[PDB]
Amino acid sequence: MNVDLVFLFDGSMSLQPDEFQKILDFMKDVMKKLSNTSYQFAAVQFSTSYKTEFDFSDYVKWKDPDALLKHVKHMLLLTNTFGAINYVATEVFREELGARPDATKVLIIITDGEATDSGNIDAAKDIIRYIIGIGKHSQTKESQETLHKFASKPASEFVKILDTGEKLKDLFTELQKKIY
Amino acid sequence: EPFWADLQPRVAFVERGGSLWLNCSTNCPRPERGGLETSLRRNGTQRGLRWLARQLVDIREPETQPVCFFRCARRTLQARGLIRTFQRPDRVELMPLPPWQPVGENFTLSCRVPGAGPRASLTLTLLRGAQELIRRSFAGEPPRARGAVLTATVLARREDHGANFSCRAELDLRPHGLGLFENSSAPRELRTFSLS
Numbered sequence: 593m594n595v596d597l598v599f600l601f602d603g604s605m606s607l608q609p610d611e612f613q614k615i616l617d618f619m620k621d622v623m624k625k626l627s628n629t630s631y632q633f634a635a636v637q638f639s640t641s642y643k644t645e646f647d648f649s650d651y652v653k654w655k656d657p658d659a660l661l662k663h664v665k666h667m668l669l670l671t672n673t674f675g676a677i678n679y680v681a682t683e684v685f686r687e688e689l690g691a692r693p694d695a696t697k698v699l700i701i702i703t704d705g706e707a708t709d710s711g712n713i714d715a716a717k718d719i720i721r722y723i724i725g726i727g728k729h730s731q732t733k734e735s736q737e738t739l740h741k742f743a744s745k746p747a748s749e750f751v752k753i754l755d756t757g758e759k760l761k762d763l764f765t766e767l768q769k770k771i772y
Numbered sequence: 773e774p775f776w777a778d779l780q781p782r783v784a785f786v787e788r789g790g791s792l793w794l795n796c797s798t799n800c801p802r803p804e805r806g807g808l809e810t811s812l813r814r815n816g817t818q819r820g821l822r823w824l825a826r827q828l829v830d831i832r833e834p835e836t837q838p839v840c841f842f843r844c845a846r847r848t849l850q851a852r853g854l855i856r857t858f859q860r861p862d863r864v865e866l867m868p869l870p871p872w873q874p875v876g877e878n879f880t881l882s883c884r885v886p887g888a889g890p891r892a893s894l895t896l897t898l899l900r901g902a903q904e905l906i907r908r909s910f911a912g913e914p915p916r917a918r919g920a921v922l923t924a925t926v927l928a929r930r931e932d933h934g935a936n937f938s939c940r941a942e943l944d945l946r947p948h949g950l951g952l953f954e955n956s957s958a959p960r961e962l963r964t965f966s967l968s
């Protein structure tokens with residue numbers, strides 16, 4: 593089964609530079625693990641605006657994820673995630689960018705879940721959406737609810753939270769507030 | 773330019789690990805959506821119709837630029853701030869001297885001052901007794917650079933037997949109204965002898 597897969601990655605100011613680098617490394621690792629014929633990839637950064645950093649044709653030409661992501665610069669602006677998701681649905685899964693019409697569409701959305709816009713992602717209904725949570729701001733109730741809103745259902749299976757090594761900091765913070 | 777957002781203070785200097793209140797405001801008549809996009813942890817919020825104040829805490833990066841925004845009709849109005857951190861010279865370390873140094877040969881003095889900065893505000897000095905041997909300002913280093921090293925070659929003399937070498941780090945934030953922070957290494961004794 594052919595699968596067109598798009599990484600939709602959060603380049604907003606709420607993510608630390610070290611976290612953004614981890615997002616980039618995550619994309620590279622996933623690509624290396626799926627470096628077969630059947631999967632082809634595209635990556636789109638989003639913050640205030642959206643940038644297709646590479647498309648399916650780029651993937652096929654270069655293959656090397658280090659090559660494909662070398663021009664990425666961290667946008668460091670807002671987090672228009674609903675807009676981004678709608679952009680991918682309508683503008684990135686296209687034959688013009690090398691998308692295959694026969695292929696199963698998948699979106700891997702990597703974000704702290706703190707969207708600064710709103711709306712619906714109905715245009716993305718028929719795309720399989722996996723959500724990858726990262727960052728201190730993913731830990732709020734509203735962010736967790738947002739991540740689940742974006743995920744395909746059952747969200748339990750499609751939502752994953754990357755451990756970036758700061759869980760003890762989140763614990764101290766919470767305990768300091770309740771215990772004093 | 774008729775409607776705007778503003779973030780106050782727009783530029784702030786905080787001690788590394790410290791906190792800061794920011795106030796994001798607008799003259800938009802009926803703002804629809806408002807916020808402050810930053811990687812910094814928050815620890816307090818207050819809001820009014822046209823403003824949002826947030827306390828940001830555990831501020832550790834050399835530099836960060838929060839983005840304040842309000843949606844106003846069809847436009848997002850935004851203002852961008854700058855939070856810089858400073859780090860005192862809590863660690864000033866002179867590298868060990870040779871157990872015994874031949875008179876008339878060179879040895880290396882190296883002062884290391886990890887993490888302190890901004891680096892452009894640091895001056896490091898190497899001393900023999902109370903005499904300053906080498907003084908180096910790091911003026912002109914990049915604004916986000918932290919830490920400093922000062923290394924110098926010194927010719928060993930008979931006179932320097934039993935003399936104490938040390939170094940001093942100064943972080944001069946007085947141009948920014950924040951004070952002069954100094955620290956010195958523990959002294960190291962030179963022991964010299966003639967190889968003849």
Ligand SMILES: *[C@@H]1O[C@H](CO)[C@@H](O[C@@H]2O[C@H](CO)[C@@H](O)[C@H](O)[C@H]2NC(C)=O)[C@H](O)[C@H]1NC(C)=O
Pocket residue numbers: 795796797798818820821822823824825
């Ligand atoms: C943050 O800023 C605003 C405006 O600079 C503060 O003051 C109020 O602003 C509104 C308009 O947004 C004015 O109509 C009022 O006159 C202001 N009220 C007061 C009491 O001065 C607001 O109080 C600030 N908030 C914090 C927490 O400092």
Ligand SMILES: *[C@@H]1O[C@H](CO)[C@@H](O)[C@H](O)[C@H]1NC(C)=O
Pocket residue numbers: 791815816829830
């Ligand atoms: C966090 O907020 C509490 C009150 O809600 C306050 O007492 C405390 O000072 C804040 N933390 C910091 C680091 O200032």
Ligand SMILES: *[C@@H]1O[C@H](CO)[C@@H](O)[C@H](O)[C@H]1NC(C)=O
Pocket residue numbers: 860861862863952953954955
């Ligand atoms: C000097 O060093 C000590 C640690 O050795 C530190 O606690 C203190 O804050 C330092 N003083 C200044 C002004 O940097």
Ligand SMILES: *[C@@H]1O[C@H](CO)[C@@H](O)[C@H](O)[C@H]1NC(C)=O
Pocket residue numbers: 876877878925927
């Ligand atoms: C010691 O260092 C100085 C400065 O580099 C050099 O000019 C001189 O030749 C050296 N002297 C000896 C004894 O090696």
Ligand SMILES: *[C@@H]1O[C@H](CO)[C@@H](O)[C@H](O)[C@H]1NC(C)=O
Pocket residue numbers: 901934935936959
């Ligand atoms: C160097 O320091 C030691 C103690 O730290 C002191 O006793 C000694 O007098 C000093 N050497 C001199 C006199 O230059």
Ligand SMILES: [Mg+2]
Pocket residue numbers: 604605606607670671704706809
């Ligand atoms: Mg964000």
